[PDB]
Design a protein around this ligand. Structure first.
Ligand SMILES: Cc1ccc([C@@H](NC(=O)Cc2ccc3c(c2)CCCC3)[C@@H](C)C(=O)O)cc1
Length: 293
């Protein structure tokens, strides 16, 4: 499963305005690479990879000229260092979560103005088409999404009135969502990822404060268990998994836009500061794929 030449890509983000940055971090030598800007600045987007290509999904362009929620899907090829537009989603989705199953991109929840989506849609890259699938049981913006064992999980978020500790799972062969065990902590804008047989939820916002606590859901035992907390509390953070470790990137702690990048080692149950982003930002999209040419 592991292979050389893989980088952690971070796309977009927010700092006083939505950002167009695409930067790639190499954990092997600690270097950052500046790559082609997004065609449209976006915060609150999600990133994912299908067939070696990096996709930026949804978000919102917060600029002095206005605030525009994004239905866009854009594809970055590391072999060419170029972005290419894809077919747009059916609705704009800010503060979105995405997950990949069998080479298809699931776009989950998000906001459009004061509308809080429970709708979900699926992208087919070979046909460049989006199609709606079953909506979630709960409206969720700032939702964390991860895929384990070809099942799609939507974790936490904000429904328009309350931040959520609830979570649910999508079963594709049934086109059906079912609630799973609720988290021990209310988390909106948490970083959600998959490591081994567990869904991790790191950080987030409970309506009052940002969190440094981290918990993981064992899909076999159906229980949430806290692991070691991050050094820096954060919400609207980027997250990914690389070489069996969790990386959290940036975010907002209620006072400062973080440039901190922490790395979680599950064998030692410890977090370590590995690098800092070139500038503090929140609401990034993050994914791992091969290094560019
Ligand atoms: C991407 C994302 C996901 C979830 C959220 C959720 N809020 C937070 O985490 C608090 C937060 C986070 C970043 C920033 C601010 C506030 C205010 C200043 C600008 C940056 C949102 C749904 C909610 O619970 O109100 C925000 C953004």
């Amino acid at each position: 499963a592991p292979k050389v030449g893989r980088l952690i890509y971070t796309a977009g983000g927010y700092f006083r305005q939505s950002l167009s940055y695409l930067e790639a971090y190499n954990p092997s030598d600690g270097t950052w690479l500046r790559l082609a800007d997004l065609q449209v600045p976006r915060s609150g987007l999600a990133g994912c990879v299908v067939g070696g290509l990096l996709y930026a999904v949804g978000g919102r362009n917060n600029s002095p000229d206005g605030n525009t929620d994004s239905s866009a899907l854009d594809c970055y090829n590391p072999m060419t260092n170029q972005w290419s537009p894809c077919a747009p989603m059916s609705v704009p989705r800010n503060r979105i979560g995405v997950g990949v199953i069998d080479g298809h991109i699931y776009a989950v929840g998000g906001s459009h103005g004061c509308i809080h989506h429970n709708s979900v849609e699926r992208y087919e890259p070979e046909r460049d088409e989006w199609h709606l699938v079953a909506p979630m049981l709960t409206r969720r913006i700032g939702v964390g999404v991860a895929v384990l064992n070809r099942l799609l999980y939507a974790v936490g978020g904000f429904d328009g009135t309350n931040r959520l500790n609830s979570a649910e799972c999508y079963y594709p062969e049934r086109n059906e969502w079912r609630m799973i065990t609720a988290m021990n902590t209310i988390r909106s804008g948490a970083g959600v990822c998959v490591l081994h047989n567990c869904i991790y939820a790191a950080g987030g916002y409970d309506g009052q404060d940002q969190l440094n606590s981290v918990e993981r859901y064992d899909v076999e035992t159906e229980t949430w268990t806290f692991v070691a907390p991050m050094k820096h509390r954060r919400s609207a953070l980027g997250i990914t998994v690389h070489q069996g470790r969790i990386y959290v990137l940036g975010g907002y702690d209620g006072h400062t836009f973080l440039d901190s990048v922490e790395c979680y080692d599950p064998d030692t149950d410890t977090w370590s500061e590995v690098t800092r982003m070139t500038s503090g930002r929140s609401g990034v999209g993050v994914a791992v794929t091969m290094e560019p040419c």
